[PDB]
Design a protein around this ligand. Structure first.
Ligand SMILES: OC[C@H]1O[C@@H](O[C@H]2[C@H](O)[C@@H](O)[C@H](O[C@H]3[C@H](O)[C@@H](O)[C@H](O[C@H]4[C@H](O)[C@@H](O)[C@H](O)O[C@@H]4CO)O[C@@H]3CO)O[C@@H]2CO)[C@H](O)[C@@H](O)[C@@H]1O
Length: 128
């Protein structure tokens, strides 16, 4: 029923400690530069099947002129089983608005772990 698959497979990210402020990702989009696989203006949820580490979703805007950098680092709205769910309403509250006209970056990233994080699926779906 109209799920969009952003990724399916077995993507492994090693990240054992904070060390630098270099921070590897499982998945990234840059909306100003890449055609988009889903429409940010719909009411959407992003669901990630993962294991091995705790997970976050980043929505970011780089600093430009007198508008500051936004780094909306979001924990899952909830986890069930092996799946993290993130919702548009949650993302918009962390981003400061639901206006994504200036969104530079979307990233799915692990927190530090000994074994690394593996993502097997990322799905966008549109909700009521
Ligand atoms: O135009 C600028 C340029 O930006 C590039 O991206 C940078 C951001 O500019 C930079 O601020 C940033 O971010 C993370 C940092 O990497 C994380 O380490 C941090 O995380 C916390 C963590 O949540 C704590 O629990 C833990 O204890 O410590 C760490 C702190 O070390 O939060 C900051 C928020 O900024 O990293 C980005 C990497 O890209 C773009 O790449 C470039 O294109 C833009 O032009």
């Amino acid at each position: 029923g109209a799920d969009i698959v952003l990724f399916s497979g077995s993507k492994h990210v090693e990240f054992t400690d904070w060390g630098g402020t270099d921070w590897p990702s499982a998945y990234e989009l840059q909306p100003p530069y890449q055609t988009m696989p889903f429409d940010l203006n719909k009411n959407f949820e992003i669901k990630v099947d993962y294991s091995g580490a705790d997970i976050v979703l980043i929505f970011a805007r780089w600093e430009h002129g007198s508008k500051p950098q936004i780094w909306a680092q979001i924990s899952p709205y909830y986890v069930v089983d092996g799946t993290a769910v993130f919702t548009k309403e949650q993302i918009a509250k962390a981003y400061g608005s639901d206006d994504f006209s200036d969104l530079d970056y979307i990233g799915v990233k692990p927190l530090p772990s000994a074994d690394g994080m593996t993502v097997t699926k990322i799905v966008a779906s549109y909700t009521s």
